[PDB]
Every structure is written in C-alpha cells, then in structure tokens.
Amino acid sequence: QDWLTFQKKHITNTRDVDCDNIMSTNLFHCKDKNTFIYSRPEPVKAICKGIIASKNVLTTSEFYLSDCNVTSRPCKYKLKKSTNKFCVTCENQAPVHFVGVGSC
C-alpha cells in the first residue's frame, strides 16, 4: 500500500528467511505464500524511478528471491530460493505492492 509497508512485507536483509517465524506474525498471519527480495532498499526502490501513476512494472534485472511456501502443516513453510525478475506496482516512484515473480 506504500513503500514502508512494501519494505516490511517484501524486502529481506537475509536470504535465508526464517519463514516459520516471520510468516506467523500479524503482517503475514500464516498465509500460504510470500515472496521476499534479498536486497537493501534503494536498488529495489529504483525499479520505480520516474513512474508516477500506479503502474505494474517488471524488473529489468533479476534479483535474489526467497519464497516462503506453506507445507502440509499450517503455518510451517519450505523456503525456496531463486533468481528471477519480479513485478511490482510502482506508484510515485516507489514499489507499493508485490505482484508476482517472473511476469506482470
């Protein structure tokens, strides 16, 4: 919904996200999946430089992604690491929603 929330929801300072901890908090409330981007914030913010009206943008470069995928046990996850482009909703020069991996 805004850049601060996007950072909290989708940017990780570690590749090896502790999914069973973080996904259990209110922000994620044991949902089935969440994609995290392993980067400091500025190169992620830069994806949306110049984009004012809300628009979905596919990254030009690939990034390190860490995905928390639920297992057969509720709120327990398998972490999957991959390198891919991703699509975000850019608004007023910052990411404000994560859309998907690989494609808009």
Numbering used by the authors: 1 to 104
Give me lines lifted from the publication on this model.
Onconase® (ONC, Alfacell Corporation, Somerset, NJ, USA) is a ribonuclease with anti-tumor activity isolated from oocytes of the Northern leopard frog, Rana pipiens. ONC is a member of the pancreatic ribonuclease superfamily whose archetypal member, ribonuclease A (RNase A; EC 3.1.27.5), holds a central position in the study of protein chemistry, enzymology and molecular evolution. The ribonucleolytic activity of ONC is essential to its cytotoxicity, and the target of this activity is intracellular RNA.
The atomic resolution structure of ONC·SO4 was determined from an orthorhombic crystal at 100 K. The data also enabled the resolution of discrete alternate conformations for the side chains of six residues (Asp18, Ile51, Ser54, Thr60, Thr83 and Asn84) to the extent that their 2Fo−Fc electron density is continuous when contoured at up to 1.4 σ. Hence, at the P1 subsite, residues Lys9, His10, His97 (the latter in the inactive, B conformation) and Phe98 (the counterparts of RNase A residues Gln11, His12, His119 and Phe120, respectively) coordinate a sulfate ion. The N-terminal pyroglutamate residue (Pca1), which serves to align Lys9 for catalysis, is now refined in a puckered conformation rather than the planar one described by the rtONC·SO4 coordinates. The refinement directs its side chain into a more extended conformation than that reported for rtONC·SO4, placing the Nζ atom 5.22 Å from the nearest sulfate O atom (cf. The side chain of this residue is partially disordered with weak electron density beyond Cβ, and the refinement suggests that the major side chain rotamer intrudes into the space occupied by the bound pyrimidine. Comparison with the rtONC·SO4 data reveals that the low temperature used during X-ray diffraction brings about a 7.7% compaction in unit cell volume, with the largest reduction (5.8%) affecting the b axis. Our analyses of the present structure have, for the first time, identified appreciable collective motion in ONC.
